[PDB]
Nucleic acid binder design. Structure first.
Ligand SMILES: [Mg+2]
Ligand SMILES: [Zn+2]
Ligand SMILES: [Zn+2]
Ligand SMILES: [Zn+2]
Lengths: 141, 43, 159, 49, 65, 196, 559, 263, 85, 168, 133, 114
RNA sequence: AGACG
DNA sequence: CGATCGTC
C-alpha cells in the first residue's frame, strides 16, 4: 500500500526525516523540567519519518536499559560482555553434543526491559538474574 | 547467536570511525575493542 | 605571552610581552631579522637548532621537546631520565635516532644489537666483517646464560 | 527459538560473515600529495555483474 | 526451569506458590502485584522470585523422550 | 557484570547475618562499590535500579527503553507512593553489630550477568614439568602444565632492580641451561662428548 | 626474542587477583593449592632438620609439607609415589623441595611490566580460595584492578636469589619511586574516602568504638589517649584516633588556600610528633603525593615502618567506615529545580551567542584575525561559546551539590570523580568532536538526514545540551557515539604505539650503568654523563625544595 | 520478672511481631544473628539417584531437595551424624526419605514435597515430615514429568545449622528497627529539601513520642526497645524460632564459661 | 698488574646495596650448606638472618673486587666497608 | 624557587626543634663563628666524588653547587637565630644529620640507570590519554603533541607535522 | 598546676561554617578591653547563642592510659559544663606587647590574644580548657 | 577447589582449643583471648557486657580476617580483678539476661491467640 | 585464527 | 623493515 518504504544511504541523501511522527509534525501556538531537551521543527518539508529511533541499534545494544543515559564507550563495553554471559542459549541444549555449554540454573527475565527485547526473545531465553544489590562501602572487600 | 548472524567484516580512509551514513544501518555502539575496532560491524 | 621578570624593587613580576608563532622553519634567516631577540629565538625543530646553533644547543632543545610531551599530559618524570635519553642521542656528535637506523647501527656488541631489530642481517655482517663480541653487554650475557655486570654482578666477590 | 541462517559442515554450525567492499562502477575524484605532479585523479573501478 | 524453592535473598519458601500464582492470573483475572501480595509475597526480594520467573521446564517437556 | 559495562569479580562471600540489612529484613545478594560510579558515568545503572525496585514492588515490567519520556522523577513519584524514599536510599543496619549505618544505602534490584572464565578455569602453577622438543624450554598452556612467560619485558624489570643472579637463575636453572663442550683453539661445538 | 631475551619458566603461578583489606602491603595471598604446587630446594642443616623431616612426613597433599627429597648422587625421591614416602630418614646436605611457606620472598608481576614496580618481591601468606590476594595500596605500581586481572608469581630456587628479592625488589623498598622522585603507592578507594569522612571536625567517636579502633591498630601502645572532649560525654575526635596509626617523630606542614594557623576551613595540614593538629586528611596528605605522610614516613622512619603505616591506616579507616557506611544513589546526580532553571537558561544564552555570531558571519560583517580563515575563526568562536556553556552549567551544578552529596564527597576525598563527571552527569554533556572539529557533514551538506542542508547550529553539529540524568536524544546519542568511537580507536592505537616506543627506549639504554667512578657509561665504556643526572644523586632520595635566596624583594631579602 | 521484656503485637503460626524492651543492642543483634544462622534443623543432606529420565540434572534436583523444609519440632532428640557412633548414618542421627514418580498420564505430572515418603524408623518424634502450607496440600514443586519420564531416588535428611548451609535455616526474614525517630542520631539522613518530608515514617513511630523540636541532644542516651518480626519457614514453629534462638545463644555463652573451668 | 694499592682508593667507602645483597646472598648460601658460623646465635635458624648478624657484627671474611672502567680494581673488605643505608 | 634536591633541610630543623625541646623564649648559646664557620665546614664535608686531583676536585665542587646554595640560604646566621632558634647542641646535630643524609642520597655504582630512564619515560607515555591536545578549541593553537610528537622526536623525523618558530 | 588562665568572655559571633555539631566562637574579655578568643565548640553537647557570658578556664591537671570517669568516688576539677583536653602548637607575637596562643583539641582549634599570661602558657601536649554557664 | 569446608566455621579441628589466654605485653592486668570457631554473635555480645563492668578498664574485640572464624578479645581490669573473672561475670550476666527473656517471651506467647 | 585485561 | 601484553 506504500505506507512504508526501503531507503539506502544513497537515497537517504535526498530525503528529509522526522524522528517522532507526532512530536515532529502536528502544529504550533509550561513544560516538564525532568524530561530531556528536544529542539523544535525548523525543517518541515518532510518526506519520511523514523519507524523508531531505537531501531538504530543492533542485538547487543538492544539489551541495555536506558543507553541514552550512559557514556558511549560503556554502551560499547556492555555490547562485548553480553556475549560472554550465560543462560539458556536454546531449549534443546539437553539434546546437543557441543564443545562447551553454560546454562544458568534459574534464569530470570529482567525487571527493566527494552521494547526491542520482545523480538530478541530475551524474556523467553534470559541471560542473568534480578539480584538485590546495595551500592556500599562494607568490609572493603 | 542473533548478534553473530548480524556481523560485518571490513578487510584492508577512515573505516574504523562511525561515519554519519551508518545511521539506522549499522549499530553505533557494538564493535570489538582494540584489534578490529570499527572494522567489525553489526547490522 | 606571560613573562616572569624581576621588577626594579626585587620581586618577580608578571610582565606580558608580544611574541610571534610561525607555520614553517628557516631559523638561520629569521634570526638575522632586525627587531627580534636572537638570544631567545626557538623552534620545535630540534634538528634545525642542532644545524644552526650546535650539538649542545640541540641537546637542550631535544630535552625541552621530550619534557613538553610529558608535561602536556600533566605527568612529571625526574630530569635525570630524559636527561640520559637526550644525552644518548647527543653523545655521537649529531642526533642518533631511537630506531634500527640510529642506535642499532652503533659500534656496540653484535649479539646485543641482534636482540632488537634486523636480527639475522646484523649477525651476517658480524660474520662478514669478523666482529669480536665484548660480552660486557647485558643482552650478550642474557643469551650466554651468565650473571651479567649489572648491580649485583657489577663487582666480583672473593675470600 | 532457533533462527537458522547458518550451515552445518561436518556437524559444525557455520556463519558466513558479511564482507564489506567498496562498490564497483563508481566515479570518484581525489586530490594528490604535495610532491606528485598529478594534482587530481578521477577513478572508476569497473566490474561486470 | 521450575520456580526455585525459597527466595535467594531471604529464603521464604516460594516453591509452593507457582501453581497458585498462575491460577490467580489466568482464572481469577487478577494482576501480578495483587496476585503476588495475595500469595503473601510482601517483600520485594520474594516478589522478583516469582514475577521474574521464566518456566522453561514447560518448553523442555515438549521434547519427545 | 551489570548491563552497563560494569565487570567485576567476587572479592568475598558473606552469609545473611554478617551482611548489612533493611528494617524489612531485606539483605543484598551483591555489594557493589560507590566508587565504581563517578568516573564511569553510568547513570542508567542507577536509573535501572530505581525502575526495577518500583517494578518488583508494583508487580509490573519496568520500561527501560531508550528514546522515551520515562523520567527519574516519574519513577521517584511511583516508588515513594510504595513507601520508600523516592531516590532508592534505604536505612541499613550493620550485620555485625545491629547498629544503624550513619549512611543510607542505594538499595534495590538490578539485572546482573554471570560471565564465562572463572578462577578455576584460569589457575595455573608449574614448579617444573614438560620441556618442548626443539627448545628444551617449558611447554605452553595450563592443559599441557606449561611455563609462565618471563618475557624480555619482565627481564628488563629485573635489570632495573639490578638483581643479576635472579635473572641468571630464571633464564637457566628454571627453564633452559645446558652443559656443552667447546675447543680451546677453534672455539666451536666440535668437541665430541665421550664421557666416562 | 622468544627464546633468549625471554622464555617460559619453571616455579611460576598465575590466577585472578583479588583485594585484601587484611593483608600487609608487602604480603601476597597465595591459594593453598598453588602453595602445594610450587617448591623451594632447602638443604638439610641441624637448624632445620626437625622441621624438614616433619614437612616430609606431612607429604605433598597436606599443606606445610614437601614434594620431592634429593640426596647425594642427584636422585629425586617423589613423595607422592615412593614406597618409602613415610620412611625418609633425612641426612644433612640432602635437599628437601618443600612447599611455599609463609613469609617466603616471591616475585609478583602484572603484565605489561614497563616498570621496576610492575615486578616486586612479596612475603607469602598461604590462604584458602582460588585468587591471589594483594593489599589495595600495591594496586597502582602494578596498574591492577580486580575486574578479572591475572598476576604472575615466581619462586627463587637459590639462597642468593631469595636475598636479591628481599634486599632489592621488596615492596617496602619500592615505596618512594625514583621515576618521579615521589612515592608510587598511597591510600586509595574506601580508605581514601573514609579517611576524609573520619577526619571532619564534626566526626566524633565514643569509648565502645574508640577502644575497638585502638585495638585494631596492631602496634598500639595499649594507652587510651585522653578524649578531646571530657564534658557531658568523653568524646574522641576522628583525627585523634587516626593519629594513633601515625608513628612518633613525624612532622608535616602544608597550607592550601585559606589556610592560616587557626585553619578556619579545616584545610591544609599540620602534624606534630605524629598527632594531627588540624586539616582534613585527603589525597594531598595521604595519596602518593610529593610531600605526603608516606614520602615523609619512608624517609624519616624507614620502608618497613612506612609499609606498616599503610596497614595501620587501612585497618582503622576500613573499620570506622564499615560501621559508618557509604553509598551513591541516583539522588546524588539530581540538582535543584532552581539550579536546573539556571543551567537551562545558561545553555540558552550560549545558543544565542552562537546564533548571533552566525548571523554576523552570513552578513559578511565577520572579520577574521590574521593567520586564519573567516570560517576558521567562526568555528573557533562557536566551539568556545559552547565549551564555556557546559563549564558554567557544570559549575552551577557543583555549587548546588551539598557536602552530603556522595559524588561531591568522593571528589572532595579525591577517591573518585572530577568536575566533568558532576557536569556531564547532572548539568550538560556538551559538545562532541571528531578529529578535533565538531560533527562533520557525512551526508551532503548535513550531519544527519533529519537536518536541512547547511545547518551549523550547535544541535546539528554534535552539541549535547542534555545531561546523562535527563537523557540524550537520538541525534545527541549518535553524535556522542561518533565521539566515543574515536576514543576507542586511538585508545587501541596508543596501547600499540607506546609499547613499541617502550621497547626501543629500553633496547637503546639497556647497558647504561653508573660505574665505580660515579661515571655513567655503556658496554663499550663510553661516557654518557660524568656525574649521574649531573649531581651523582639517586632520584629516590630527592625532594622539591624552596631556594630562599632566589625570590622575594631586595628589601625582604635584606630583612 | 527481671531485665529484658517482651510485648507481642501480632502472632500467627508463621510470624511474631514484638517489642524487645530493656535489652542491649549487642544482645538484640546476637539474637537476630543466631535466629538466622545457629538454630539446628533437619534438611536432606544426601540424595542417591536410581533413575532420572527427567528434563532436569540430578544435582539440580538434589539441590532443591535440600531446600524442601522438613519437620524439625523434636530435632534435639536427633544426633548430628558427626557425633553419632554409627558407620555413616542411622535412625539416631538421620531420617530417610523416598521419592518415586512416573509420568503415567499423557498430561504433565507434577512431583510435590507430599510425594516424599519417610522410610526410616522415626522412634516417635515430630521429625522429617515435609512442611506443607499449600492450601491444596502439596507444598513445593520438586519437578515435572512427561510420559516415559521417571524419578526414583533416596534421601538422607540430617541435623545442621544455616552457618554450614542456608538450607538449614529455620528462620527466613527478621524485621529489625530501633529508635524510629532518630532521637539517638544513629543515622544522618540524605536529603534535598526536607529529610522529614523525603523519608517515610515507620509503623513504629506510633509506639514512641516525637523528639519535640526545641530540645537539646540527649548525648548519654542508649539503644533499648527493638521492634522485631520473626518469620518462620515452618520447619520449627514461631515461638520456637525465638525460644531456641535465646536457648542456642545461652548455650554458646555457657560453653565459654565451661571452657574457662577446663583451663 | 692491574690492581690499585690500599693507599689512594677513590671508590665509595660505604657498601653499595648490591654489594650488601650479594654479600648476604653468598653468606646465606654458605650457612645453608653447613658452613661454620663466625658469630653467636640468638636461637637463630634462618641462613639470611644469620648472615645479617655476621654482617652487623662485621665477621664476614669476604672481599669486594671493584672493577673500574679501564679494568683496574679496588679490593675492599666487608669489615672496612661502612654499612649505613 | 621550588626544585628537587637531596636532603629535606626543613624536616631536619623541625626534628631538631622537637628532639631538643626548643623554647623561643631563651637566648641561644651559639656564636657568629659557630654558625658561619659551621655551615662553611659542612660544605667541604658533602661528598659525591672522593678523588684529590684538580679535575675530580672541580667536578665535585660543581656537583654540590646548587645544594650548597640551598644549604647557605637555609643555614644563614639571621635565620638560625631569629627564625629557627637553634642551640649549639641542636645546631651541631643538624650539621651531622645533613652530612649523613647527603652521603645516603648518593647514587649506587651498579644502578642500571639506563633501563630505569627508559621505563621512567615509557610507563608515563603508555598512560598518555589522547593524541588530541587540549588546544583543540582554538584554531591558532594546533601543534602536534602526545604520542605522535614523541614518535617524531625519538625517530629524529626529518619532516615533522607542525614545524614552528617562536620569535621574541 | 592548678590554673594557668581564667576569664569571663562575651560572645560576638557563632558560626556553623559547613558543620552541624561544631561552631567557631568569636568572643572578647568583658574585663580586659584588649583580650580576645577564637574557639571551635561542640554545640550539640554544649550550645552557645549570641551575646552569652561564659567563664573560660585553662588548667593543667584535673600522662598514662585513660581510665573512665567512674563516679564511684572520683572527683575532678569539674564545677564546669564544657571540658576539653588539647595541645599547644604555636606561640605567635602580634607586635611588642601582644602574644597569641594556639591550642588544638583533637582538631577543635583555639586562639587567645593578650599578654597577661606570659610564664603561664608554655609549650605543652598538656592543657585543659574549662567552660561554665 | 581451594574452598575450606563449611563445618570449619563452628567445628574445632584436632589441636585447636576453644579459648587461648595470652597475657598482654603492652599493659598491666591486661589479657588477650583467642576465641576459636566464633564470630560477631559472641564477640560483640561479650565485649558490650564487659564494658558494663565498672572494674573493666578496657574491652575490645576483632576479627582479623573474614576467612577464618576466630576472634580476639582484649580485657584490661583494675588491680585486684583477674580479667578471667571479668569475662566469667560477663558470661553469667548474659545468661541471666537471656534466661529472663526466655521466660518473659513464653509468658507473653501463652497470653496470645492465633 | 578466536577470546581477555 | 618495524608494528603493546598475557592466555584457548
Ligand atoms: Mg583490568
Ligand atoms: Zn525474599
Ligand atoms: Zn677445534
Ligand atoms: Zn547414626
Amino acid at each position: 500500500e506504500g505506507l512504508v518504504e526501503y531507503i539506502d544511504a544513497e537515497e537517504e541523501e535526498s530525503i528529509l526525516i522526522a524522528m517522532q511522527p507526532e512530536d515532529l509534525e502536528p502544529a504550533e501556538a509550561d513544560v516538564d523540567p525532568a524530561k530531556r531537551i528536544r529542539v523544535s521543527h525548523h525543517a518541515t518539508t518532510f518526506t519520511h519519518c523514523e519507524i523508531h529511533p531505537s531501531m538504530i541499534l543492533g542485538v547487543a545494544a538492544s539489551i541495555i536499559p536506558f543507553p541514552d543515559h550512559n557514556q558511549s564507550p560503556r554502551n560499547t563495553y556492555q555490547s562485548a560482555m553480553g556475549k560472554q554471559a550465560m543462560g539458556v542459549f536454546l531449549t534443546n541444549y539437553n539434546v546437543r553434543m557441543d564443545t562447551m555449554a553454560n546454562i544458568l540454573y534459574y534464569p530470570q527475565k529482567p525487571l527493566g526491559t527494552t521494547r526491542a527485547m520482545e523480538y530478541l526473545k530475551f524474556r523467553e531465553l534470559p541471560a542473568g538474574q534480578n539480584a538485590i544489590v546495595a551500592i556500599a562501602c562494607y568490609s572493603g572487600y | 547467536t542473533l548478534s553473530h548472524l548480524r556481523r560485518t567484516n571490513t578487510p584492508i580512509a577512515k573505516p574504523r570511525q562511525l561515519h554519519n551514513t551508518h545511521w539506522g544501518l549499522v549499530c553505533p555502539a557494538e564493535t570489538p575493542e582494540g584489534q578490529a575496532c570499527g572494522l567489525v560491524k553489526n547490522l | 605571552y606571560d613573562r616572569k621578570v624581576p621588577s626594579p624593587t626585587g620581586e618577580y613580576v608578571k610582565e606580558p610581552e608580544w611574541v610571534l608563532e610561525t607555520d614553517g622553519v628557516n631559523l638561520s634567516e629569521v634570526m638575522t631579522v632586525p627587531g627580534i631577540d636572537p638570544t631567545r629565538i626557538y623552534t620545535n625543530s630540534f634538528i634545525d637548532i642542532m644545524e644552526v646553533l650546535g650539538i649542545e644547543a640541540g641537546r637542550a632543545a631535544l630535552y625541552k621537546e621530550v619534557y613538553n610531551v610529558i608535561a602536556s599530559d600533566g605527568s612529571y618524570v625526574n630530569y635525570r631520565h630524559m636527561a640520559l635519553l637526550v644525552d644518548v642521542m647527543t653523545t655521537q656528535g649529531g642526533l642518533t635516532s631511537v630506531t634500527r637506523h640510529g642506535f642499532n647501527r652503533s659500534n656496540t656488541g653484535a649479539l646485543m644489537r641482534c636482540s632488537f631489530e634486523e636480527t639475522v642481517e646484523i649477525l651476517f655482517e658480524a660474520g662478514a666483517s669478523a666482529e669480536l663480541d665484548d660480552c660486557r653487554g647485558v643482552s650478550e650475557n642474557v643469551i650466554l646464560g651468565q650473571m651479567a655486570p649489572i648491580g649485583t654482578g657489577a663487582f666480583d666477590v672473593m675470600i | 527459538f532457533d533462527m537458522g541462517g547458518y550451515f552445518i559442515i561436518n556437524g559444525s554450525e557455520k556463519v558466513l560473515i558479511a564482507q564489506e567492499r567498496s562498490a564497483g562502477n563508481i566515479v570518484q575524484v581525489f586530490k594528490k600529495a604535495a610532491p606528485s605532479p598529478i594534482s587530481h585523479v578521477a577513478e572508476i573501478r569497473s566490474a561486470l555483474e | 526451569m521450575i520456580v526455585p524453592v525459597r527466595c535467594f535473598s531471604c529464603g521464604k519458601v516460594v516453591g509452593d506458590k507457582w501453581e497458585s500464582y498462575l491460577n490467580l492470573l489466568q482464572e481469577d483475572e487478577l494482576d501480578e502485584g495483587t496476585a503476588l501480595s495475595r500469595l503473601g509475597l510482601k517483600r520485594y526480594c520474594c516478589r522478583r522470585m516469582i514475577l521474574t520467573h521464566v518456566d522453561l521446564i514447560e518448553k523442555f517437556l515438549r521434547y519427545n523422550p | 557484570a551489570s548491563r552497563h559495562g560494569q565487570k567485576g569479580t567476587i572479592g568475598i562471600t558473606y552469609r545473611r547475618e554478617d551482611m548489612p540489612f533493611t528494617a524489612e529484613g531485606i539483605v543484598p545478594d551483591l555489594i557493589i562499590n560507590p566508587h565504581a560510579i563517578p568516573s564511569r558515568m553510568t547513570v542508567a545503572h542507577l536509573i535501572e535500579c530505581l525502575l526495577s525496585k518500583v517494578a518488583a514492588l508494583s508487580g509490573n515490567e519496568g520500561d527501560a527503553s531508550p528514546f522515551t519520556d520515562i523520567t527519574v522523577e516519574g519513577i521517584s513519584k511511583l516508588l515513594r507512593e510504595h513507601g520508600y524514599q523516592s531516590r532508592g536510599f534505604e536505612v541499613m543496619y550493620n550485620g555485625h553489630t545491629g547498629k544503624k549505618l550513619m549512611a543510607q544505602i542505594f538499595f534495590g534490584p538490578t539485572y546482573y550477568q554471570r560471565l564465562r572464565h572463572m578462577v578455576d578455569d584460569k589457575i595455573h602453577a608449574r614448579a617444573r614439568g614438560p620441556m618442548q622438543v626443539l627448545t628444551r624450554q617449558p611447554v605452553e598452556g595450563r592443559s599441557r602444565d606449561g611455563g609462565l612467560r618471563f618475557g624480555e619485558m619482565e627481564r628488563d624489570c629485573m635489570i632495573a632492580h639490578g638483581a643479576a643472579s635472579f635473572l641468571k637463575e630464571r633464564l637457566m636453572e628454571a627453564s633452559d641451561a645446558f652443559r656443552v663442550h667447546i675447543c680451546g683453539i677453534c672455539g666451536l661445538m666440535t668437541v665430541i662428548a665421550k664421557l666416562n | 626474542r622468544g627464546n633468549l631475551m625471554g622464555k617460559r619458566v619453571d616455579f611460576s603461578a598465575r590466577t585472578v587477583i583479588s583485594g585484601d583489606p587484611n593483608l600487609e602491603l608487602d604480603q601476597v595471598g597465595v591459594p593453598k593449592s598453588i602453595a602445594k604446587t610450587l617448591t623451594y630446594p632447602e638443604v638439610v642443616t641441624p637448624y632445620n632438620i626437625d622441621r624438614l623431616t616433619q614437612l616430609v612426613r606431612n607429604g605433598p597433599n597436606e599443606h606445610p609439607g614437601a614434594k620431592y627429597v634429593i640426596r647425594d648422587s642427584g636422585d629425586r625421591i617423589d613423595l607422592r609415589y615412593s614406597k618409602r614416602a613415610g620412611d625418609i630418614q633425612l641426612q644433612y646436605g640432602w635437599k628437601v623441595e618443600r612447599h611455599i611457606m609463609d613469609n617466603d620472598p616471591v616475585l609478583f608481576n602484572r603484565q605489561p611490566s614497563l616498570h621496576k614496580m610492575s615486578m616486586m618481591a612479596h612475603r607469602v601468606k598461604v590462604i584458602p580460595y582460588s585468587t591471589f590476594r594483594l593489599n589495595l595500596s600495591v594496586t597502582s605500581p602494578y596498574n591492577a584492578d580486580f575486574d578479572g586481572d591475572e598476576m604472575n608469581l615466581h619462586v627463587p630456587q637459590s639462597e642468593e636469589t631469595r636475598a636479591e628479592l628481599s634486599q632489592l625488589c621488596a615492596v617496602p623498598l619500592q615505596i618512594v619511586s625514583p621515576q618521579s622522585n615521589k612515592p608510587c603507592m598511597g591510600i586509595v578507594q574506601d580508605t581514601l574516602c573514609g579517611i576524609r569522612k573520619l577526619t571532619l571536625r564534626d566526626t566524633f567517636i565514643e569509648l565502645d568504638q574508640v577502644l575497638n579502633m585502638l585495638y585494631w591498630v596492631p602496634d598500639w601502645d595499649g594507652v587510651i589517649p585522653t578524649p578531646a572532649i571530657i564534658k557531658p560525654k568523653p568524646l574522641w575526635s576522628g583525627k585523634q584516633i587516626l593519629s594513633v596509626a601515625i608513628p612518633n617523630g613525624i612532622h608535616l606542614q602544608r597550607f592550601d588556600e585559606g589556610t592560616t594557623l587557626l585553619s578556619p576551613k579545616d584545610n591544609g595540614m599540620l602534624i606534630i610528633d605524629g598527632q594531627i593538629i588540624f586539616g582534613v586528611v585527603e589525597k594531598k596528605t595521604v595519596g602518593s603525593s610529593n610531600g605526603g605522610l608516606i614520602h615523609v614516613v619512608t624517609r624519616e622512619k624507614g620502608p618497613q615502618v612506612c609499609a606498616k603505616l599503610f596497614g595501620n591506616i587501612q585497618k582503622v579507616v576500613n573499620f570506622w567506615l564499615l560501621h559508618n557506611g557509604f553509598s551513591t544513589g541516583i539522588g546524588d546526580t539530581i540538582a535543584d529545580g532552581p539550579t536546573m532553571r539556571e543551567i537551562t537558561e545558561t545553555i540558552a544564552e550560549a545558543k544565542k551567542k552562537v546564533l548571533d555570531v552566525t548571523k554576523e558571519a552570513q552578513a559578511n560583517l565577520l572579520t577574521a584575525k590574521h593567520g586564519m580563515t573567516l570560517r576558521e575563526s567562526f568555528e573557533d568562536n562557536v566551539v568556545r561559546f559552547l565549551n564555556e556553556a557546559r563549564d558554567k552549567a557544570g559549575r552551577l551544578a557543583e555549587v548546588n551539590l551539598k557536602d552530603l552529596n556522595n559524588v561531591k564527597q568522593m571528589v572532595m576525598a579525591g577517591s573518585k570523580g572530577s568536575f566533568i563527571n558532576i557536569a556531564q552527569m547532572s548539568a550538560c554533556v556538551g559538545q562532541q568532536s571528531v578529529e578535533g572539529k565538531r560533527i562533520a557533514f557525512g551526508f551532503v551538506d548535513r550531519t544527519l538526514p533529519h537536518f536541512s542542508k547547511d545547518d551549523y547550529s550547535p544541535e546539528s553539529k554534535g552539541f549535547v545540551e542534555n545531561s546523562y540524568l535527563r537523557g540524550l536524544t537520538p541525534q545527541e546519542f549518535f553524535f556522542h557515539a561518533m565521539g566515543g568511537r574515536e576514543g576507542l580507536i586511538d585508545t587501541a592505537v596508543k596501547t600499540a604505539e607506546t609499547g613499541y616506543i617502550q621497547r626501543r627506549l629500553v633496547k637503546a639504554l639497556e647497558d647504561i650503568m653508573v660505574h665505580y667512578d660515579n661515571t655513567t657509561r655503556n658496554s663499550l665504556g663510553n661516557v654518557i654523563q660524568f656525574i649521574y643526572g649531573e649531581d651523582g644523586m639517586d632520584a629516590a632520595h630527592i625532594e622539591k625544595q624552596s631556594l630562599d635566596t632566589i625570590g622575594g624583594s631586595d628589601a625582604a631579602f635584606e630583612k | 520478672e527481671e531485665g529484658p521484656q517482651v510485648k507481642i503485637r501480632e502472632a500467627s503460626k508463621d510470624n511474631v511481631d514484638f517489642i524487645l524492651s530493656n535489652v542491649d543492642l549487642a544482645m538484640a543483634n546476637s539474637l537476630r544473628r543466631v535466629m538466622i544462622a545457629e538454630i539446628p534443623t533437619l534438611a536432606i543432606d544426601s540424595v542417591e539417584v536410581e533413575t532420572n529420565t527427567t528434563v532436569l540434572a540430578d544435582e539440580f534436583i538434589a539441590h532443591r531437595l535440600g531446600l524442601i523444609p522438613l519437620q524439625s519440632m523434636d530435632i534435639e532428640q536427633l544426633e548430628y551424624s558427626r557425633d553419632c557412633f554409627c558407620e555413616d548414618h542411622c535412625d539416631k542421627c538421620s531420617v530417610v526419605l523416598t521419592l518415586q514418580a512416573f509420568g503415567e498420564s499423557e498430561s504433565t505430572t507434577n512431583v510435590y514435597s507430599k510425594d516424599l515418603v519417610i522410610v526410616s524408623n522415626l522412634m516417635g518424634r515430630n521429625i522429617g515430615h515435609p512442611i506443607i502450607q499449600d492450601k491444596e496440600g502439596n507444598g513445593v514443586l520438586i519437578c515435572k514429568l512427561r510420559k516415559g519420564q521417571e524419578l526414583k531416588l533416596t534421601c538422607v535428611a540430617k541435623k545442621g545449622i544455616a552457618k554450614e548451609h542456608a538450607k538449614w535455616g529455620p528462620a527466613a526474614a527478621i524485621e529489625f528497627e530501633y529508635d524510629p525517630w532518630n532521637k539517638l542520631k544513629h543515622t544522618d539522613y540524605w536529603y534535598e529539601q526536607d529529610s522529614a518530608k523525603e523519608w517515610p515514617q515507620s509503623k513504629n513511630c506510633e509506639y514512641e513520642d516525637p523528639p519535640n523540636e526545641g530540645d537539646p541532644f540527649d548525648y548519654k542516651a542508649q539503644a533499648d526497645t527493638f521492634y522485631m518480626n520473626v518469620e518462620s519457614v515452618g520447619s520449627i514453629p514461631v515461638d520456637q524460632v525465638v525460644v531456641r534462638g535465646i536457648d542456642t545463644l545461652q548455650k554458646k555463652v555457657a560453653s565459654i564459661l565451661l571452657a574457662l573451668t577446663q583451663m | 698488574e692491574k690492581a690499585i694499592p690500599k693507599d689512594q682508593r677513590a671508590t665509595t667507602p660505604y657498601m653499595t646495596k648490591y654489594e650488601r645483597a650479594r654479600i648476604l646472598g653468598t653468606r646465606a648460601l654458605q650457612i645453608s650448606m653447613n658452613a661454620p658460623v663466625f658469630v653467636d646465635l640468638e636461637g637463630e635458624t634462618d641462613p639470611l638472618r644469620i648472615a645479617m648478624k655476621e654482617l652487623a657484627e662485621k665477621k664476614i671474611p669476604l672481599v669486594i673486587r671493584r672493577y673500574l672502567p679501564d679494568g683496574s680494581f679496588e679490593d675492599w673488605s666487608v669489615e672496612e666497608l661502612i654499612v649505613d643505608l | 624557587a621550588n626544585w628537587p634536591l637531596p636532603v629535606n633541610i626543613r624536616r631536619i630543623i623541625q626534628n631538631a626543634q622537637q628532639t631538643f625541646h626548643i623554647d623561643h623564649t631563651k637566648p641561644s648559646d651559639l656564636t657568629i663563628k659557630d654558625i658561619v664557620l659551621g655551615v662553611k665546614d659542612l660544605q667541604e664535608n658533602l661528598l659525591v666524588l672522593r678523588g684529590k686531583n684538580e679535575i675530580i676536585q672541580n667536578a665535585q665542587r660543581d656537583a654540590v653547587t646548587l645544594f650548597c646554595c640551598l644549604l647557605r640560604s637555609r643555614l644563614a646566621t639571621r635565620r638560625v637565630l631569629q627564625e629557627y632558634r637553634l642551640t649549639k647542641q641542636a645546631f651541631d646535630w643538624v650539621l651531622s644529620n645533613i652530612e649523613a643524609q647527603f652521603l645516603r642520597s648518593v647514587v649506587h655504582p651498579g644502578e642500571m640507570v639506563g633501563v630505569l630512564a627508559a621505563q621512567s619515560i615509557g610507563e608515563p607515555a603508555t598512560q598518555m590519554t589522547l593524541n588530541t591536545f587540549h588546544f583543540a578549541g582554538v584554531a591558532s593553537k594546533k601543534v602536534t603533541s602526545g604520542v605522535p610528537r614523541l614518535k617524531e622526536i625519538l625517530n629524529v623525523a626529518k619532516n615533522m607535522k607542525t614545524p614552528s618558530l617562536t620569535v621574541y | 598546676s592548678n590554673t594557668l588562665f581564667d576569664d569571663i568572655f562575651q560572645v560576638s559571633e557563632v558560626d556553623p561554617g559547613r558543620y552541624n555539631k561544631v561552631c567557631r566562637i568569636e568572643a572578647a574579655s568583658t574585663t580586659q578591653d584588649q583580650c580576645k578568643l577564637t574557639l571551635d565548640i561542640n554545640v550539640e553537647l554544649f550550645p552557645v547563642a549570641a551575646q552569652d557570658s561564659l567563664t573560660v578556664t585553662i588548667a593543667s591537671s584535673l600522662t598514662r592510659s585513660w581510665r573512665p570517669p567512674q563516679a564511684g568516688d572520683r572527683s575532678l576539677a569539674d564545677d564546669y559544663d564544657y571540658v576539653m583536653y588539647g595541645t599547644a602548637y604555636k606561640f605567635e607575637e602580634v607586635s611588642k606587647d601582644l602574644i597569641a596562643v594556639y591550642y588544638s583539641f583533637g582538631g577543635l582549634l583555639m586562639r587567645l590574644e593578650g599578654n597577661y599570661r606570659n610564664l603561664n602558657n608554655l609549650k605543652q601536649e598538656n592543657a585543659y580548657l574549662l567552660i561554665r554557664r | 577447589m581451594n574452598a575450606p569446608d563449611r563445618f570449619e566455621l563452628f567445628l574445632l579441628g584436632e589441636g585447636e582449643s576453644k579459648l587461648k589466654i595470652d597475657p598482654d605485653t603492652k599493659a598491666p592486668n591486661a589479657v588477650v583471648i583467642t576465641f576459636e570457631k566464633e564470630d560477631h554473635t559472641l564477640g560483640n555480645l561479650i565485649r558490650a557486657e564487659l564494658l558494663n563492668d565498672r572494674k573493666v578498664l578496657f574491652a575490645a574485640y576483632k576479627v582479623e580476617h573474614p576467612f577464618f572464624a576466630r576472634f580476639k578479645l582484649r580485657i584490661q581490669t583494675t588491680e585486684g580483678y583477674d580479667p578471667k573473672d571479668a569475662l566469667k561475670n560477663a558470661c553469667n550476666s548474659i545468661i541471666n539476661k537471656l534466661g529472663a527473656l526466655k521466660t518473659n517471651f513464653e509468658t507473653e506467647w501463652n497470653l496470645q491467640t492465633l
